[PDB]
UniProtKB/Swiss-Prot annotation, chain A:
<protein>
    <recommendedName>
        <fullName>Large ribosomal subunit protein eL6</fullName>
    </recommendedName>
</protein>
<comment type="subunit">
    <text>Component of the large ribosomal subunit. May bind IPO9 with low affinity.</text>
</comment>
<feature type="modified residue" description="N6-succinyllysine">
    <location>
        <position position="44"/>
    </location>
</feature>
<feature type="modified residue" description="N6-acetyllysine">
    <location>
        <position position="76"/>
    </location>
</feature>
<comment type="function">
    <text>(Microbial infection) Specifically binds to domain C of the Tax-responsive enhancer element in the long terminal repeat of HTLV-I.</text>
</comment>
UniProtKB/Swiss-Prot annotation, chain C:
<feature type="modified residue" description="N6-succinyllysine; alternate">
    <location>
        <position position="84"/>
    </location>
</feature>
<dbReference type="GO" id="GO:0006412">
    <property type="term" value="P:translation"/>
</dbReference>
<dbReference type="GO" id="GO:0042273">
    <property type="term" value="P:ribosomal large subunit biogenesis"/>
</dbReference>
<keyword id="KW-0597">Phosphoprotein</keyword>
<keyword id="KW-0677">Repeat</keyword>
Swiss-Prot record, chain D:
<comment type="similarity">
    <text>Belongs to the eukaryotic ribosomal protein eL33 family.</text>
</comment>
<keyword id="KW-0963">Cytoplasm</keyword>
<dbReference type="GO" id="GO:0042273">
    <property type="term" value="P:ribosomal large subunit biogenesis"/>
</dbReference>
<dbReference type="GO" id="GO:0003723">
    <property type="term" value="F:RNA binding"/>
</dbReference>
<comment type="function">
    <text>Component of the large ribosomal subunit. The ribosome is a large ribonucleoprotein complex responsible for the synthesis of proteins in the cell. Required for the proliferation and viability of hematopoietic cells.</text>
</comment>
From Swiss-Prot, chain E:
<dbReference type="Pfam" id="PF01775">
    <property type="entry name" value="Ribosomal_L18A"/>
</dbReference>
<keyword id="KW-0597">Phosphoprotein</keyword>
<feature type="modified residue" description="Phosphotyrosine">
    <location>
        <position position="62"/>
    </location>
</feature>
<feature type="modified residue" description="Phosphoserine">
    <location>
        <position position="70"/>
    </location>
</feature>
<dbReference type="GO" id="GO:0003735">
    <property type="term" value="F:structural constituent of ribosome"/>
</dbReference>
Amino acid sequence: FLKQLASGLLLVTGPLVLNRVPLRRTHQKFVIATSTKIDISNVKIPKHLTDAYFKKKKLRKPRHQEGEIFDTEKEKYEITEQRKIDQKAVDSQILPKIKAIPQLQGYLRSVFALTNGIYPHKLVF
Amino acid sequence: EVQVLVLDGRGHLLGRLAAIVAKQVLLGRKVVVVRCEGINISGNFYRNKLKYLAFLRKRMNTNPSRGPYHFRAPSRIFWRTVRGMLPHKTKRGQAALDRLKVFDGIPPPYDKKKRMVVPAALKVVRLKPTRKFAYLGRLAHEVGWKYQAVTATLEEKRKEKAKIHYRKKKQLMRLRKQAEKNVEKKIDKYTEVLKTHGLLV
Amino acid sequence: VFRRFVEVGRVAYVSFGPHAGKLVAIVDVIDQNRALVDGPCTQVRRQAMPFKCMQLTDFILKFPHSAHQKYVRQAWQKADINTKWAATRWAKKIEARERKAKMTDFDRFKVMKAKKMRNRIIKNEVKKLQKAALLKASP
Amino acid sequence: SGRLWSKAIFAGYKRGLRNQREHTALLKIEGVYARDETEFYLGKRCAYVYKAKNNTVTPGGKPNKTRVIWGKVTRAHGNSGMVRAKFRSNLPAKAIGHRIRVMLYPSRI
Amino acid sequence: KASGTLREYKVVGRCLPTPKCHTPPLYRMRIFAPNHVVAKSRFWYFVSQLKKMKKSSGEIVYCGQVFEKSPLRVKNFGIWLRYDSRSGTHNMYREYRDLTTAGAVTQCYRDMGARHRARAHSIQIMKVEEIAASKCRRPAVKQFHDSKIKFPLPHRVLRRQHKPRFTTKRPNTFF
RNA sequence: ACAGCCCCCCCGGCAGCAGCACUCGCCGAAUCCCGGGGCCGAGGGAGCGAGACCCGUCGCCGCGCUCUCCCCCCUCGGGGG
RNA sequence: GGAUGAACCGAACGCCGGGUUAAGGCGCCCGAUGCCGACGCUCAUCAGACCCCAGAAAAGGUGUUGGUUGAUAUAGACAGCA
RNA sequence: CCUCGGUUGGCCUCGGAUAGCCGGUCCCCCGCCGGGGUCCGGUGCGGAGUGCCCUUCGUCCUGGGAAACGGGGCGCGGCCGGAGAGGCGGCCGCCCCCUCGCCCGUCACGCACCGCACGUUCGUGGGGAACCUGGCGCUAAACCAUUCGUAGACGACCUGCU
Ligand SMILES: [Mg+2]
Ligand SMILES: [Mg+2]
Ligand SMILES: [Mg+2]
Ligand SMILES: [Mg+2]
Ligand SMILES: [Mg+2]
Ligand SMILES: [Mg+2]
Ligand SMILES: [Mg+2]
């Protein structure tokens, strides 16, 4: 977790080299806050990383009313070079702090699951 | 749960275990009760035998072939008790009843598996030590069950094989302890982690 | 047959109730079900306590029955019950249960990794010992 | 990659002895056998997932046989870890004794 | 009269002043009651039985709980009471061991209910007194007068019979 | 006495105080703050004012700032006293 | 709610959602004690188990548990043996 | 294709006692293993079901530890154990693979589908018709009709027929 945005959505990046999660918005209602933390103070989150930045973009539908020819083009979302630059800039200064504590990178590479013996109300996160 | 719950009937009180089993099968769980000849009933044997003889007396006067079916095997007795605690005349009750299997002794599907125990139905904790109790196997035998002797013989054979298996497991565990003693320089790095987080005192 | 007895000065561990997880000393006996009970160094003031929530330990203190907090506390502090209790296997099993319960998700992951490697090494050694023991051939 | 939901059993409807209120259901969450342990699951989304004959649209995927009746846990029931759940449509009676998933979605932790 | 954990109440009352006596005498009783409302009701019942008083003709000038002056000391209580059985009225002297007088009286009410099926409305507690250990008459109380009392807990029944409900290990009763 | 217990003292002192060492109450003009879950959203022209004109951000109630002037602390005019 | 029931107990009724109760209940049927409930009493070879209510008396018991009154006893009781 | 849906890791087992248990080890007896007597430990069960095992992001450079007498074969052939419902499990010989998979690190990459549900397993699920593709194998009864009369209201039954 990096910061809350203007709409209350969290901005997160489980670094893309670790678990393929880019700089991406998420909802605090649909996340579990664990107890493990890293000191991401004095790192520079870029100012343009805003809700308008992360808002989805669409192509359809100008100059087209009735569909006889499929408008399924552009459906392949494209990762912008600006997005790649921002991801590199954030990860280059988040990763050294992750490597500062042992096997946190392995923890971040792993995914969470419910074993048949464990129960979420008895789990300390 | 999603797997079968196997309960050892030895040392368990009839109605207590049957109530637990009825609730379990109504909650959509597969339950298998084994060694139903080891089930205990509180109260002395003569009184319990009198109860079952009264049950035998209850029959349809016009046509006993239609009347109450008095089952003599201990497994079938326990099954009828569970059916008494189930709503067996509805589809839900019949499905719950189908989710229950009962056996005398421990048959080959289940003699190689661990068996659970229900403490809330155990005689040792549910019954005062001075009180008298009856064995379901003896009651069934003296009310008409025909396979007490052969079940005892097969149970003795199963116990011999289980003793052999347990000796093998003890030998394996002794060897594992010896292995843990042998390798500890390359193990203490993880033993400290386990001890720190509470596993492996 | 019996080795632990309810008596004056016997130290008991509280299993449940408002004072669960604490050590107390039995000061007196009331009517077969209760005891006058005092933890002067484990922060349990003198009160009645049922025997059902008591689990007797192996420590016995030497003070007369219905003595005051002063004498019970001196008996507790001399031959310190706290350090001896912490040294016993019972208390460290309790502590292990507590620290297993308070383990977080990252700690669970690290324990999983350590236990994985430890079990693999132990299993390899067990296989080696089995193969070493299998070479028995003597008429 | 993982189960990510708690197992529960549709025990039955809220009811007296001879009256049944089908608008709310009783759920038995596995491992929760006391009333004080039910506070975690209050407000959590719950789903009755089943299969049918005709294909239905799947959000973010191809149509398949899977159907869901969504709901959520409202309050604790009894003293033994029962909970009450309200679903968008009343649960079918054939689901009694079957699986309900408690999805952890409205997380408060 | 129901029960709970009873409390001792000192209840002091008197008649209302009349142009026959301007200062009627004050009367005090010890009432063991769940609360002060029941305490006042029982006070009126008893003074109506003893003196010629009524709640309407008199007043209660004080009703205060009597705290036990040594709740940290085990002591022996003798209780003189009378009760109505199904076929008569009997006087009883009972003995209990407790820290508090009110607790001893509660023990007495429970024990009378258990042994004689005597409901609390049938029971009249007429005297409660702390007694010396040498003046006790009931062997069940006297057997605890041992400076070296010692006994084990022989057959400890499992009480956590549903946590877990299903298990592999059978419980142990020896500790 | 080579432990202790009870009562009165010639009188106590300190801390705490219905105790965050869970022994035993009744309460709140002697009572306030914060948080979580559940169910619900019925109504639809509220403008004494400009003589309304973008869809009345309106009434009652509780507040803040300006039409006075000094300073203080952070930002680089903005924010906080 | 009392299994069941014109009259009992609770409560009187438009169609619904939420909360809480009454009388009554909370092993399973069957919602709810899956409380580490409290103290005792009781073993029945016809046990007992809740208003109306759906079965019992006089009289007994060296079964057991309390209680009342009286009596004997180191000037040696009681019971056994002589 | 048609239809039926459930499920979302496993535990492969002493006997049991409860006013007692469990484990380990030296001497005696009986086939090199078990049973006794010592002795040593544990016992609010830690050789613990309040437990154990497995643990799913995947790869690429890349070092250190574990191993290297190691794992994989819907690969062949052989053997053994299991009968209470064995529907299962284990061990050898030959061959073909990789030195990878386990832990801690280096190094970057993968649709990063732009906050969102039915995701994730058992599973190559069960059942039914049908097409193609190969190999190895089989060529039968029942009933009616007839007959019998040990049978019989009729059915049914006992029988005979190169
Ligand atoms: Mg206070
Ligand atoms: Mg509206
Ligand atoms: Mg009715
Ligand atoms: Mg009736
Ligand atoms: Mg309502
Ligand atoms: Mg009922
Ligand atoms: Mg229920």
